[PDB]
Amino acid sequence: WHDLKWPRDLRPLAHHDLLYMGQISEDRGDFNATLRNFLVPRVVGSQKHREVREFIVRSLKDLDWDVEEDCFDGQTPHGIKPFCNVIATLNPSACHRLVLACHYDSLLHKEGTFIGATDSAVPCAQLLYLARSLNGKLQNQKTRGDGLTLQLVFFDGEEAFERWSSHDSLYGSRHLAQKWHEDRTSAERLESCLERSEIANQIDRMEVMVLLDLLGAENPRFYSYFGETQPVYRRLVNIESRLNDAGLMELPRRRRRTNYFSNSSTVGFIEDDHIPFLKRSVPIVHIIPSPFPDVWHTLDDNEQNLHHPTISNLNKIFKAFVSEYLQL
């Protein structure tokens, strides 16, 4: 009951695949094409928000993923609002899901039009970019019958309408967590669960949720925010280290290394889309910088303040991480 091992043995990415995940050569224009669709105000209930959702759904339906639009109405300080989570699953029958998540709504800012380029246009784009860039390998992985799949969740209504409170925020995530907790299931209904796993409902199928937010500014610092997922987090540290050793990271000068993923833990908690899951025992890795970028919730969280080299470096880490976890 001390030092419980991660339930899935984590096999290090082959040098071959590392070197391959780590050259985002000319991908580059493809990522930016994706991102431009998100660099618009995406306020809840707005037309542009509707359109971003349609772009997400279609991008993933086109890659033959199972896509569910989980729409519902909820009460806010601004009245009743329609919300719509997007849940995409590569192989719906697989018992276990590696879940990558972000929110696609943008903050309603008092002072003017807010783009939320790091929050979370970039993360949204990174999830679609991972799905597209790894499609070939994911489609092959899907037919192994090994009981693991990739699942992407684009939450709606993360942002508070007024002052952040338990009542005013995380509308999409609170809704989804409860729903999946109440929707009962078991191993016998599913494809190839791990041997002595305890599945009683849909939320138990989330093996780990990796939540991305506030990405795209220069030089983020990440820490392990949860002891529970330290074995998963350590894989990001190791991947980043291997990418630097292979000289595959974009840096301003030679003889520099990236050090985004600190090999320490931090004493800090961040009120976010992972919480209602945390209460239901879903292990969480929160990929969010500490401290937040300086542009956080300002009108300067915009396209021009994004840092291309950092974004391409993060993309390499994430592609390598998904490849290693799913053994692509």
We find the least distance from the C-beta atom of residue 158 to Zn ion, in angstroms, to be: 5
Query: Does residue 188 sit in helix, strand or coil?
Result: helix
* Site membership for Zn ion, residue 286 (CB under 5 A): yes
Q: Is 303 a catalytic residue?
A: no
Q: Which is nearer to Zn ion, 134 or 260 (CB)?
A: 260
DSSP structural state of residue 179: H
- Distance from C-alpha of 318 to C-alpha of 248, rounded to nearest angstrom: 14
For Zn ion, the closer CB: 213 or 324: 213
- Which residues neighbour 148 within 8 Å (Cβ) at sequence distance 6 or greater? 8, 94, 95, 96, 97, 98, 207, 326
- Name the amino acid, one letter, at 8: R
Q: Which of 156, 158, 301, 324 is catalytic?
A: 158
| Contact flag: residue 301 with Zn ion (CB under 5 A) | no
Which stretch, 7-15, 49-57, 66-74, 253-261, contacts Zn ion (CB under 5 A)? 66-74
Complex with Zn ion: residue 156 or 213, whichever CB lies closer: 213
Contact between 310 and 24 under an 8 Å Cβ cutoff? The reply is: no
Phi, psi of 240 (to 5 degrees): -60, -45
Please identify, among the stretches 13-21, 60-68, 206-214, 237-245, the one whose residues bind Zn ion according to the rule CB under 5 A: 206-214
Spatial separation of the C-alpha atoms in residues 118 and 218, rounded to whole Å = 11
Taking each continuous run of H as one helix and of E as one strand, the counts in the chain are 9, 8
* Nearest alpha-carbon partner for 146 in 186, 91, 109, 103: 91
* 327 contacts 11 by C-beta, under 8 angstroms: yes
Site string for Zn ion, 242-281 (x = CB under 5 A): ----------------------------x-x---------
Q: Does 70 engage in binding with Zn ion (CB under 5 A)?
A: yes
Please give the Cα distance from 149 to 324 (Å, whole number): 13
Residue among 213, 228, 273, 324 flagged as catalytic: 213
Give the pairing type, strands 79-89 and 96-103: unpaired
Token couple for 314? 């993060």
Binding-site residue ranges for Zn(2+):
119, 159, 297
Pick the closer one to Zn ion by CB: 42 or 286.
Answer: 286
**Binding of Zn ion by 68 (CB under 5 A):** no
In whole angstroms, the minimum distance from the beta carbon of 38 to Zn ion comes to 13
Choosing from 204, 207, 213, 324, the residue that interacts with Zn ion (CB under 5 A) is 213
> Closest distance between Zn ion and the C-beta of residue 109, in Å?
10
- The site for Zn ion, by CB under 5 A, has a size of 7
Footprint of Zn ion on 83-122 (CB under 5 A): 119
Does 207 help bind Zn ion (rule: CB under 5 A)? Answer: no
Which helix H or strand E contains 176, and what residues bound it? Answer: helix 171-182
Residue (119 or 204) nearer to Zn ion, CB: 119
CB of 129 to Zn ion, least distance (A): 18
Of 101, 134, 95, the closest CA to residue 8 belongs to 95
Residue 220 structure tokens: 């983020």
Active site residue 158: yes
Residues with catalytic function = 158, 213
| Binding positions for Zn ion, rule: CB under 5 A | 70, 72, 119, 213, 270, 272, 286
